[PDB]
Amino acid sequence: MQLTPFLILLRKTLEQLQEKDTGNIFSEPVPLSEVPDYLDHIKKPMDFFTMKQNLEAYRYLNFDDFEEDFNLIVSNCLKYNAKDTIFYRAAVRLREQGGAVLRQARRQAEKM
Numbered sequence: 001m002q003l004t005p006f007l008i009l010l011r012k013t014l015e016q017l018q019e020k021d022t023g024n025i026f027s028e029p030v031p032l033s034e035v036p037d038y039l040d041h042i043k044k045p046m047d048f049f050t051m052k053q054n055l056e057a058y059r060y061l062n063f064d065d066f067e068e069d070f071n072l073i074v075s076n077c078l079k080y081n082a083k084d085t086i087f088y089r090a091a092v093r094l095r096e097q098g099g100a101v102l103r104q105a106r107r108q109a110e111k112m
């Protein structure tokens with residue numbers, strides 16, 4: 001029963017957020033093989049594959065918690081990376097574009 005309007009809204013919204021990540025930079029966890037110090041800085045890694053995992057395990061009880069996980073993708077990236085990096089620039093753009101997606105989707109999560 002992923003067939004409830006709240007859960008269909010989260011699935012839709014997650015798709016729309018991944019669409020804004022045009023480089024697929026945030027599609028999967030930051031790889032510790034390529035990035036060995038990541039956990040020295042970042043206490044709670046997050047990425048869209050993890051969010052999708054969470055969604056399907058009914059771990060998102062409300063829209064707030066879903067939105068907090070998206071914000072972690074962005075805030076982690078801005079925290080870890082220098083300003084002059086593809087990653088940081090991507091996160092700034094994702095914050096801007098994804099904030100708008102979330103604005104609209106929250107409107108619908110209220111109506112429930």
Ligand SMILES: COc1cc2c(cc1NS(=O)(=O)c1ccc(C#N)cc1)c(C)cc(=O)n2C
Nearest residue numbers: 025026028029030031034035077080081086087
């Ligand atoms: C999911 O792949 C990554 C995501 C990353 C980071 C690194 C990777 N992987 S990587 O180190 O293999 C890599 C290095 C350079 C580019 C470019 N351009 C892309 C990936 C790094 C270094 C930081 C980061 O915030 N994110 C989101």
